[PDB]
Amino acid sequence: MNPPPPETSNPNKPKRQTNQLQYLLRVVLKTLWKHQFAWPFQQPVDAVKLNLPDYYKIIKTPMDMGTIKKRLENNYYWNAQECIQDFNTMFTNCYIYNKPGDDIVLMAEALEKLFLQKINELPT
Ligand SMILES: Cc1ccc([C@H](C)Nc2ccc3c(c2)N(C2CC2)[C@@H](C)C(=O)N3C)cc1
Numbered sequence: 006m007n008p009p010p011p012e013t014s015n016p017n018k019p020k021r022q023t024n025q026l027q028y029l030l031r032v033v034l035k036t037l038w039k040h041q042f043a044w045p046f047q048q049p050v051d052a053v054k055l056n057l058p059d060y061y062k063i064i065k066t067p068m069d070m071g072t073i074k075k076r077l078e079n080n081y082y083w084n085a086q087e088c089i090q091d092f093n094t095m096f097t098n099c100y101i102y103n104k105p106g107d108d109i110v111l112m113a114e115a116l117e118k119l120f121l122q123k124i125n126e127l128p129t
Contacts, residue, residue: 006053008061011068013075024128025085030077033123034070040119042112046070046095063102068094085127092120 037043048071052060061067073091075081082088099113 006058006061007049007051008067010049011072013072013081014079015081018081019083020080021083022080023084026077026080026082026088028128029085029088029124030074033120034074034077036123037116037120038070038074040116042115043070045109045112046099046116060102064098066094067098068092070095089124096120 038047046069049067049069050057050060050064052058068091070092073088073095076091077088096113096117099109103110
């Protein structure tokens with residue numbers, strides 16, 4: 006039931022170390038990582054273990070903070086916007102599969118509120 010996880014290295018792809026990308030790893034991701042609600046989002050959804058055989062029938066572009074962390078550590082991104090997009094894909098997937106008011110949604114919303122606070126100002 007589990008698909009292969011998103012790639013965390015791609016050589017066909019050009020890489021960049023920007024000040025914003027370093028900050029997204031050192032400050033943004035690491036703060037979110039320690040949040041009390043971060044743990045469901047620290048690795049790909051394990052649909053077999055959660056016995057959610059429908060998850061990957063619905064979610065076709067999965068994303069999680071473990072994948073983002075590995076991408077950042079591998080300089081996988083060209084710019085901060087690409088990384089921010091991965092965060093937003095992660096949150097949106099949770100809002101798509103689940104319903105407003107669900108506990109997992111409350112957790113994603115708390116992480117998203119903090120994410121938006123931390124990315125409001127990025128380095129130059
Ligand atoms: C409040 C509560 C209940 C269960 C769990 C289980 C143990 N782990 C887990 C990790 C990530 C996800 C989910 C479950 N959900 C399930 C709907 C619960 C899927 C759909 C989803 O979208 N994500 C992001 C954690 C937190």
